Amino acid sequence: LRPIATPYPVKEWLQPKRYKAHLMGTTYVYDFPELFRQASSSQWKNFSADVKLTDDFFISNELIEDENGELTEVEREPGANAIGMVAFKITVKTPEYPRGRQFVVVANDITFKIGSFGPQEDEFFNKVTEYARKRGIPRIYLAANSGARIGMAEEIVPLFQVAWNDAANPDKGFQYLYLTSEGMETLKKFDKENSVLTERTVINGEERFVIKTIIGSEDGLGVECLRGSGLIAGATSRAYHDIFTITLVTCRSVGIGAYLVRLGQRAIQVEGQPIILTGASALNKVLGREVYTSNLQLGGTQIMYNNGVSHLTAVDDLAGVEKIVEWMSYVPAKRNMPVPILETKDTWDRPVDFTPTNDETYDVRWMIEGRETESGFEYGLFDKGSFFETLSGWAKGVVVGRARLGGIPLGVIGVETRTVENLIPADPANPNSAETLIQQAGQVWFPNSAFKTAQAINDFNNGEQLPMMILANWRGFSGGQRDMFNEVLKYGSFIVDALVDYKQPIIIYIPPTGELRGGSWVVVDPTINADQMEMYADVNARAGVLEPEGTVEIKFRREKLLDTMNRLDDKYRKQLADRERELLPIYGQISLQFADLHDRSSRMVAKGVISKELEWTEARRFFFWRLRRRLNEEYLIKRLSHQVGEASRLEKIARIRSWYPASVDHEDDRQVATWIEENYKTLDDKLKGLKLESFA
Amino acid sequence: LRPIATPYPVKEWLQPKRYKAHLMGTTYVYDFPELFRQASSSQWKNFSADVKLTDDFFISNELIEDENGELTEVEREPGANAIGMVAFKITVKTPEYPRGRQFVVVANDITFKIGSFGPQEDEFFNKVTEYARKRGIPRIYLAANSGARIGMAEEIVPLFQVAWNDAANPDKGFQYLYLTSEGMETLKKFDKENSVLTERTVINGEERFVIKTIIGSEDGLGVECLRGSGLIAGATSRAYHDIFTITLVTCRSVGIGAYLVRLGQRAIQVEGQPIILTGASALNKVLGREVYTSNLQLGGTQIMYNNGVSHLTAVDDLAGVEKIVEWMSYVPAKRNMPVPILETKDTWDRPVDFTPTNDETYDVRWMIEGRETESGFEYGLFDKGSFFETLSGWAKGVVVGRARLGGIPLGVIGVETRTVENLIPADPANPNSAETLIQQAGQVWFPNSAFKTAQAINDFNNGEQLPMMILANWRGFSGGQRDMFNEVLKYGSFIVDALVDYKQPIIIYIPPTGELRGGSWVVVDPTINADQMEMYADVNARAGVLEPEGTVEIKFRREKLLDTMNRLDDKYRKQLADRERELLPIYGQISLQFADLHDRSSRMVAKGVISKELEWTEARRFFFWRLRRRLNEEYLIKRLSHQVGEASRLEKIARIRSWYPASVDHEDDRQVATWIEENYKTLDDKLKGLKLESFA
Ligand SMILES: O=C(c1c2ccccc2cc2ccccc12)N1CCC(N2CCC[C@@H](C(=O)N3CCOCC3)C2)CC1
Numbered sequence A, B: 001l002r003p004i005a006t007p008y009p010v011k012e013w014l015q016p017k018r019y020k021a022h023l024m025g026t027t028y029v030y031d032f033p034e035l036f037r038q039a040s041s042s043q044w045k046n047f048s049a050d051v052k053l054t055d056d057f058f059i060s061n062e063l064i065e066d067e068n069g070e071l072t073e074v075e076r077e078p079g080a081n082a083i084g085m086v087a088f089k090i091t092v093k094t095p096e097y098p099r100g101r102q103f104v105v106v107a108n109d110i111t112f113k114i115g116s117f118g119p120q121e122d123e124f125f126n127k128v129t130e131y132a133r134k135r136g137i138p139r140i141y142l143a144a145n146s147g148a149r150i151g152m153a154e155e156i157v158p159l160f161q162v163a164w165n166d167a168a169n170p171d172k173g174f175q176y177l178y179l180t181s182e183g184m185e186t187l188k189k190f191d192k193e194n195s196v197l198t199e200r201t202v203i204n205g206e207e208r209f210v211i212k213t214i215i216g217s218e219d220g221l222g223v224e225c226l227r228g229s230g231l232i233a234g235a236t237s238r239a240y241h242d243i244f245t246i247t248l249v250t251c252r253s254v255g256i257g258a259y260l261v262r263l264g265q266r267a268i269q270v271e272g273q274p275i276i277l278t279g280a281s282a283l284n285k286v287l288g289r290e291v292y293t294s295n296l297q298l299g300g301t302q303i304m305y306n307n308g309v310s311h312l313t314a315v316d317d318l319a320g321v322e323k324i325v326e327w328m329s330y331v332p333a334k335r336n337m338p339v340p341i342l343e344t345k346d347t348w349d350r351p352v353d354f355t356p357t358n359d360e361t362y363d364v365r366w367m368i369e370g371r372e373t374e375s376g377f378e379y380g381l382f383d384k385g386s387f388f389e390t391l392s393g394w395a396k397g398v399v400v401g402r403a404r405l406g407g408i409p410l411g412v413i414g415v416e417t418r419t420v421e422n423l424i425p426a427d428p429a430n431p432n433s434a435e436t437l438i439q440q441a442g443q444v445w446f447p448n449s450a451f452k453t454a455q456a457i458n459d460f461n462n463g464e465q466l467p468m469m470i471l472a473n474w475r476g477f478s479g480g481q482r483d484m485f486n487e488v489l490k491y492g493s494f495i496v497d498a499l500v501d502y503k504q505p506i507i508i509y510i511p512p513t514g515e516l517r518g519g520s521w522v523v524v525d526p527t528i529n530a531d532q533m534e535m536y537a538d539v540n541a542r543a544g545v546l547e548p549e550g551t552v553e554i555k556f557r558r559e560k561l562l563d564t565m566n567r568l569d570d571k572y573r574k575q576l577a578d579r580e581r582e583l584l585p586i587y588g589q590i591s592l593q594f595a596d597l598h599d600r601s602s603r604m605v606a607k608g609v610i611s612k613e614l615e616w617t618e619a620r621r622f623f624f625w626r627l628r629r630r631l632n633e634e635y636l637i638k639r640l641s642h643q644v645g646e647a648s649r650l651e652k653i654a655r656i657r658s659w660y661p662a663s664v665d666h667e668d669d670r671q672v673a674t675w676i677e678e679n680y681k682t683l684d685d686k687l688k689g690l691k692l693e694s695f696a
């Protein structure tokens, strides 16, 4: 016992495994539920400081397999785990779910066989994933591992013999490995006969048992660990489409560990804990030369957070747990439950204060969440303090996060107007390599930002099941050689695929000072998914195939411009060339103005390509009710889908709207949401009555 | 008329549009059905040279919209198209479908408004896509366009007026654009009142109508073209998952044209025809300096074929049409029809001649299709002349193509053992750029090859609906800094997602001299999709978590090695150090051999991670019947799925197998396929009898 004379018992002595986990720079597995309790309690303090919490607000129950391999809840002492994988069922009362919400936490025990994955850990991880999926509840994975387990048939080590070419000269080589009769008998005696595959031959009177294959009695030596890794990789790929999956890299994640991080998509990486495939030491042995000095050069935050493999970084385990808990606050309690509404001091009924100007640089985050000013806080489009930005280390030209609109949680995609830089590191493995700094202008989709946009859309859709708003402001895709060669077309196409798959309301809004041109409009147009998408343009927004300079270059050429000079200039109507030179700069400005006059939201409304033209200051009030009306109609569309089996979305929606009182303006979002919420139980009775269904 | 005195009528004079298309270096739209007829006739000649074909073997009928916008077949003169998009319904008798197969060909008319996409071309393209999809038939798109159509309100051009700050000095600036009463009246007279949005003001006695927005009377000027582009982009994204989609880049594909190429995935690019977003001329104007000299620098084959955006290149239009027709020969006639069997002179019943050796370099294509030798042709795993390689210009470390196994079409993925190089071009837009040459060793998955593998899997699955064979031979993923930073984890994960989605039989086969290690096994293990996947290892294959050098380094260290010296060496059992130095190189070899003895297919069988260990020479005979048995059982599984609605795959398969005569060995593929094919109609009666179904 060390240290002596402490006020309370030495927890690292009662369970020496806690000390081992600590010695490896990570939280001991059994102490993670306590971190979730601390993080959950902080959520309450930040929400309503006056709330009196009691320990019954949070329950953690360890899940273990029974005799028939079925998961069951247990209350046992920490460190009793017979396998290197542990799980907990968490039931927490949160500000968004005051009566309780549930989730599962799976974790590697780094103190158990270095946190390696053997067949038993793989089958348990899979069982826990299926458990989460069956219930529709989130699956949190805490990664702290050495990858797939490795071994050798340790029983064959003291028994094997070598068929030397020349016994007196070992250096001269060997023919094969073999066992003797006494070697064979040793295996027979310990019931390990099938540990080797032998072939008997007689050499100079003595019978040799030529080892043809070594199998081993102990399970979890090789391929069986690789099979199990495959099983859990496929399980995670499926879980991502079904439930909310998130991973916290808590010590290091190797091989299958690294793949699991990616397959669950949403990842929080603790500073200094690497996500690696092959370690730096092993790589130097493969390369010959001592190339790398740390695993952080391969899988640190400097790699993974900059990549977008790590969505967020955390200073320590508790910060990571706090970020999981914060992220989950935007997510339904379970699959297909409504998005969790959480109204704060910042009500829907107010104008938007922060307004962008064409002559001034702005951070898009100011439009999203507002900004502090010497003269007071300028509120933005979304609820004050609700913006939770993710993928913040990668493709900084797009800003992705979760936010709340008068309490309604949603995914937000905004455009960074400021030029962004990123540094490609020099790989020590190549002596003829140097670090490159890449600049990328704002309001242009590059391969990385196109990938980030698609990624964000998919992550809001799967598991999170959130509605979305895109504050669309792109001049197009980068069509230059570098970006075309770097497959910008592929990444842009992922955006289309991501929108086709979206199952919740989408709002595309071209903001004030914003533009949506050529290829950028194509990839985000509401006809991609008419069931979910809707588009709005601000009165101060712009849109067209080309920018005014482009339109003029193709459609308002010199002959058209000179004819305009002939019409509008008294002097024009060699003495022409001198007036041409004088007039040309201002007539170029006239044609640019003529072109820009087509690019207005009024033309967008006239041509029916936008639902409405909006005023930014009034957008919060408009979108709050539009979204709230939309969530309600979508709820009723889903109920109707059960009650028929075969009807189109247009048919379902028209039927639901036929139920509204004749006095109800179908175009009034507030009136429509107010009537539905006043009649959920009445509409339910209407639906239960429609159960006069027998259709072939 | 030019030229005079030709033997037959001058087709470029009868229809001057044919000459226009030719002048732009492309085939005239109406002449494309003839290219499909020529290509189809060549298919027959290559299959059975003696076949007598008559014109009734090929039928092309143009599709146009009727009064109610419904597609109908027409026989009209070429060049009569009122829109810049044309379509044809093709009915061809091919070697794999001698009674006929159908498909639709959509194409831009480059002679109609420069092949630009206006709202009418967009609605027609979408209508044709839906037509193809409803019928399950392939959709071939021939791209020859200038992207979305652009325009201005040409009626406002001679009418507009400028509110000069100082009329005598135009250079001093202007306030706004306006119309006069006579300008307003001109619009009123021609029923174009809504061409502008005006606001009347009186300035110095004269009434000015301030132009606030220009709308225009003509449709297809801007945003409406962008909306239509969005519609067709989403339509193509959906079509790719539903039917066989392919695109031939026949002149140039701009903006939406480029996106359509990618969204349909499978693309054949004719040499010298660019896939661009923004042209070189427009880019130089944006950049200031004359940076690019050709659109080929942005979207030529040197970019797109090297990228994997273009799956194949073609020397001319007919070569492209020939490649479409060849690709389609592996594809079912329509969605959910069986894969087209095509037996050739190369029967299933033969050994595999080409065998790889560890001491010699080989091209994996020799294992796939065989190779010519001075002593005769050495047959490979698949049918002679059946290997159709695609994505051949990109990530050359993986070899992807379609092939036939005793007539059975399937997708093949093989590993290039030879080191591959690729040149990243220097972008002229950046003066501080130089071309980089990247070497990548064989049997290692890099970001590009991981992406290509996933891409291939998805392209075999969607629309092609083919079974697949992966001749798995990877040592792992590249875990170095460069590849980790270039998101190898993301690309590797796409492989898992692609396998989870696979709906046809998969065979994973570790070939002779081949290995499957660590991360490479994980990503391809059959537990990822047990309903479709199966794994086999050759008797001369190897597999383990690490390579023997790695296993020794972690599990057969110096203390274990010295104990072995103590046991096996008479002299060992400072005088120790000298013997240690002598023994160490050979004892390192012993431990490497000990480790390798675990890596055998016998351990894989023993541990139940492979279905069987195989002999390469006998693989063709084995796989032919395994695949044929599998296709049959899968057919019966689908029929049963209709007749119940709710039963697991394990339940369905066990039930189908309960129908086999008691004498039938369920493990005998040939006997199982022979019995099913002898009883399809009997099993059908059994299924029709199971239609005593009323389950709640
Ligand atoms: O409207 C024009 C256009 C001009 C725009 C600005 C100045 C001069 C122009 C000249 C043009 C001449 C003819 C057609 C279009 C023109 N476009 C051409 C450029 C298009 N881009 C959209 C955003 C990405 C841009 C791009 O590809 N880049 C710019 C940044 O990265 C390198 C390459 C180009 C936008 C449409």
Ligand SMILES: O=C(c1c2ccccc2cc2ccccc12)N1CCC(N2CCC[C@@H](C(=O)N3CCOCC3)C2)CC1
Binding pocket: A278, A281, A282, A283, A285, A286, B441, B444, B475, B476, B477, B478, B479, B480, B517, B518, B545, B546, B547, B548, B549, B550, B551, B553, B554
């Ligand atoms: O088995 C070993 C291993 C050794 C292999 C060969 C020589 C020396 C080794 C030393 C090792 C020491 C400790 C663990 C594993 C070792 N592995 C470590 C390397 C693993 N790679 C699989 C294929 C890709 C390889 C890789 O990441 N590269 C190689 C090519 O590109 C750059 C980086 C490494 C394979 C597993």
